[PDB]
Amino acid sequence: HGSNKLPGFATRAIHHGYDPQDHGGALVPPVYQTATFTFPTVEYGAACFAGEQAGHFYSRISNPTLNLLEARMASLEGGEAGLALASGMGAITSTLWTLLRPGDEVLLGNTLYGHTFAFLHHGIGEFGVKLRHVDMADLQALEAAMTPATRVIYFESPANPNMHMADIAGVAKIARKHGATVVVDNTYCTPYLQRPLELGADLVVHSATKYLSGHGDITAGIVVGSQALVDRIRLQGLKDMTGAVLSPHDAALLMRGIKTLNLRMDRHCANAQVLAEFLARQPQVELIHYPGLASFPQYTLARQQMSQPGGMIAFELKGGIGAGRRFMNALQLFSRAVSLGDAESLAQHPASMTHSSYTPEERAHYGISEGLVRLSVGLEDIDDLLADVQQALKASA
Amino acid sequence: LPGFATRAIHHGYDPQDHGGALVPPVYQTATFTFPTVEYGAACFAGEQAGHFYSRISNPTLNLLEARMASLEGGEAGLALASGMGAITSTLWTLLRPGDEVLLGNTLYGHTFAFLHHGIGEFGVKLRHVDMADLQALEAAMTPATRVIYFESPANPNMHMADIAGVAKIARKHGATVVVDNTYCTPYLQRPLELGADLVVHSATKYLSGHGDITAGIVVGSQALVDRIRLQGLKDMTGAVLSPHDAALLMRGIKTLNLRMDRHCANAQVLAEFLARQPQVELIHYPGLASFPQYTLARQQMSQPGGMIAFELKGGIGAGRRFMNALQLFSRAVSLGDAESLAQHPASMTHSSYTPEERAHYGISEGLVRLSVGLEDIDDLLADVQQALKASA
Numbered sequence: 001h002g003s004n005k006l007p008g009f010a011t012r013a014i015h016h017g018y019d020p021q022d023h024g025g026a027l028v029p030p031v032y033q034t035a036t037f038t039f040p041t042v043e044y045g046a047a048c049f050a051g052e053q054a055g056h057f058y059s060r061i062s063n064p065t066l067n068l069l070e071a072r073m074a075s076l077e078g079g080e081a082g083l084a085l086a087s088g089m090g091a092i093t094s095t096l097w098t099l100l101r102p103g104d105e106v107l108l109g110n111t112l113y114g115h116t117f118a119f120l121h122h123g124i125g126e127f128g129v130k131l132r133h134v135d136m137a138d139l140q141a142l143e144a145a146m147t148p149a150t151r152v153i154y155f156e157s158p159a160n161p162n163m164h165m166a167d168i169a170g171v172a173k174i175a176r177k178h179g180a181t182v183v184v185d186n187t188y189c190t191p192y193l194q195r196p197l198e199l200g201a202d203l204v205v206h207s208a209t210k211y212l213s214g215h216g217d218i219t220a221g222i223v224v225g226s227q228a229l230v231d232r233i234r235l236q237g238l239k240d241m242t243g244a245v246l247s248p249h250d251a252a253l254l255m256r257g258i259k260t261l262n263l264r265m266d267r268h269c270a271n272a273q274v275l276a277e278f279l280a281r282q283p284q285v286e287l288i289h290y291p292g293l294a295s296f297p298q299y300t301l302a303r304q305q306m307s308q309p310g311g312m313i314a315f316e317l318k319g320g321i322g323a324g325r326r327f328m329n330a331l332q333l334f335s336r337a338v339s340l341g342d343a344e345s346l347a348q349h350p351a352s353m354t355h356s357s358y359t360p361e362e363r364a365h366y367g368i369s370e371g372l373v374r375l376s377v378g379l380e381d382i383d384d385l386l387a388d389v390q391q392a393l394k395a396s397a
Numbered sequence: 398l399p400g401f402a403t404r405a406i407h408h409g410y411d412p413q414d415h416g417g418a419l420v421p422p423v424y425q426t427a428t429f430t431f432p433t434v435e436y437g438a439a440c441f442a443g444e445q446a447g448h449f450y451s452r453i454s455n456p457t458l459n460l461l462e463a464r465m466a467s468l469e470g471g472e473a474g475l476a477l478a479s480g481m482g483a484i485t486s487t488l489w490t491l492l493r494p495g496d497e498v499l500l501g502n503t504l505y506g507h508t509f510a511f512l513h514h515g516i517g518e519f520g521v522k523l524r525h526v527d528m529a530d531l532q533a534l535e536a537a538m539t540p541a542t543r544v545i546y547f548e549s550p551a552n553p554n555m556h557m558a559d560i561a562g563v564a565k566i567a568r569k570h571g572a573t574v575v576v577d578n579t580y581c582t583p584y585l586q587r588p589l590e591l592g593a594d595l596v597v598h599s600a601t602k603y604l605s606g607h608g609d610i611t612a613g614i615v616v617g618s619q620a621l622v623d624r625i626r627l628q629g630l631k632d633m634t635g636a637v638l639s640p641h642d643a644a645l646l647m648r649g650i651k652t653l654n655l656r657m658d659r660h661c662a663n664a665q666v667l668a669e670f671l672a673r674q675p676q677v678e679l680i681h682y683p684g685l686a687s688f689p690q691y692t693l694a695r696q697q698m699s700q701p702g703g704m705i706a707f708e709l710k711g712g713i714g715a716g717r718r719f720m721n722a723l724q725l726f727s728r729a730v731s732l733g734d735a736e737s738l739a740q741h742p743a744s745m746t747h748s749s750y751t752p753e754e755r756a757h758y759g760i761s762e763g764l765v766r767l768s769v770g771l772e773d774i775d776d777l778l779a780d781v782q783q784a785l786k787a788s789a
């Protein structure tokens with residue numbers, strides 16, 4: 001019993017931070033689709049530029065619809081404070097622009113989302129910030145790479161595109177010892193499956209464009225961490241260095257999506273578990289990577305830090321670059337698209353799609369096979385998804 | 398070649414291409430799918446025209462961008478999540494450590510903050526110069542000068558730049574001229590036609606016109622815009638504009654001409670009034686004969702705009718009393734809305750500063766700025782009148 005008990009995840013996803021009685025009984029929070037806020041007095045106005053008063057002035061810095069979204073994402077991640085941005089890249093760039101100056105070093109996971117890699121190497125890397133890639137699964141190697149200039153450790157777990165994982169608590173422990181800020185891109189899991197801040201990370205970023213929205217109709221990013229770090233990112237990264245302002249309309253849609261997060265994630269995971277087990281037994285499949293199978297290289301780390309194994313599958317077809325094209329073109333229910341976490345099931349074959357400008361030789365040493373297909377398993381009836389994949393495997397043979 | 402108002406309503410869109418829809422459907426979608434991997438292939442290389450991901454390209458955003466490009470008379474447009482998004486995406490693309498950016502003497506506050514505390518701390522060099530003083534500008538040019546950036550007119554005294562003269566100087570040195578054209582809009586001033594390479598807008602202001610969206614625009618040559626899209630936007634800021642907000646912005650642009658006409662007509666009346674009030678020490682409105690750059694104003698701007706800055710004799714105290722008395726004008730930052738807005742920096746935005754810190758940025762103790770809106774002028778006059786009375 002007792003009132004000091006934390007409400008369950010689904011309760012907070014739906015209610016946290018909002019009481020209808022503070023807004024004329026409105027069951028759904030009204031949408032503050034306004035660019036600016038006014039003051040009753042110039043002295044009240046002075047107080048919102050001098051930090052004496054809680055309030056609002058300009059939606060780029062702060063907005064009540066965005067604030068609700070932010071406090072709710074903070075609650076779900078177990079962090080102190082949230083920030084909502086125009087995209088995942090908005091969240092990532094606003095964060096790193098704030099935390100890094102010339103001479104600082106960022107240690108990076110070995111593989112990264114493509115635009116993240118490009119921001120680092122062709123963006124902030126070109127402004128005097130040093131980059132080093134390390135296998136975050138090898139704690140001994142991470143420890144060895146730390147220098148007094150190391151300011152930020154940044155990685156995804158599971159990471160694009162191989163679902164390589166890092167031990168978050170282990171990384172946090174090394175960073176505590178040396179003094180570095182740990183940021184985890186937690187897009188693939190959501191706070192429903194994994195909570196890096198509870199494992200000792202300082203900040204988490206999300207492409208809310210993916211599972212958090214869940215419906216493929218908005219682009220959005222989220223940062224969650226300590227009040228001090230999130231405030232700094234808000235007032236420097238967002239306000240001055242990116243201008244990546246989330247529309248209140250889209251923030252409201254994001255909050256709508258978050259109300260079913262637990263139910264969608266349950267189904268994404270149950271469907272992908274069924275597909276992965278089916279695919280592991282098909283003749284055309286040479287290799288499958290799914291965190292829910294014992295064949296997964298980091299099976300125990302997955303079980304240890306993710307409450308469920310996710311909705312992403314990667315597998316290799318027998319027949320190389322060819323067989324991929326044939327599998328892909330055959331799909332009738334899965335769509336050929338590069339994204340993830342939609343209600344609609346998506347499939348990509350990077351060899352003949354994203355990385356098709358390269359030759360057979362070149363995709364290696366970036367972690368990309370010739371028959372590597374990636375699946376974002378959606379919310380459709382599993383039997384239809386099974387049938388679609390089955391029929392497409394046949395055509396790929 | 399259709400007129401401005403025709404283009405603001407129609408340019409880039411034929412209903413017959415979208416099932417007869419008079420108003421273009423809103424592409425509120427994050428991702429786009431491909432009929433084949435082959436069609437897919439020719440999008441991540443980029444020589445077959447289509448779509449892949451709303452962060453790079455999207456048809457609602459594309460229409461907005463074409464429309465804005467047509468109105469400014471430029472080759473290409475880019476739509477971003479805010480004015481700051483447009484400015485940072487631009488400058489992050491164009492500058493690297495060791496490059497220098499030449500700046501107008503005063504700038505929008507968050508632009509100043511970005512330059513001085515953001516990109517400036519990454520080894521990019523900054524120098525402020527008066528962009529109306531062509532010889533000070535020429536003398537300020539160095540081999541490192543890669544970008545010239547300013548607003549015209551500029552806060553807080555509505556100081557103008559000689560856009561054409563700046564551009565002549567810039568091309569001797571190959572430098573890129575970027576003009577923040579927020580205050581005028583393409584309806585009143587077109588910097589690309591005066592020789593600028595790129596224009597940026599806080600579309601949050603006049604372009605939207607209705608105070609309900611945050612948005613930015615860049616317009617310029619295809620090659621520069623392409624790079625700002627693929628580098629500044631995609632990689633360095635992630636300032637993605639919602640398709641919902643883009644559609645609202647296009648809705649607002651359909652009345653740009655009509656709104657700007659009323660903003661200016663209202664502001665001209667208010668300026669004439671203010672200019673002869675005894676409480677008012679000094680006034681800055683491009684439409685007054687007393688405006689120091691009256692002539693340059695009229696060469697660049699087809700109308701004198703909807704913004705007024707003036708200085709009350711009684712200093713900071715008069716400013717506070719003026720501001721607090723306003724009943725129709727709202728005390729708020731921002732501008733370019735239907736609703737009239739006013740601010741007094743010395744007691745609002747820059748209050749925590751000191752008298753000489755404020756003077757250093759050209760912020761007078763009695764300086765108030767009016768964003769004159771669309772309300773009946775007799776009502777706006779009455780509000781200003783009683784506020785002036787209260788200011789004593």
Ligand code: MET
Pocket residue numbers: 114160338339340450
């Ligand atoms: C390239 S847009 C983002 C889509 C998805 N996250 C991917 O891996 O490609």
Ligand code: MET
Pocket residue numbers: 058506507730731732746
């Ligand atoms: C300090 S919030 C941004 C400033 C406001 N847009 C202005 O016109 O002054």
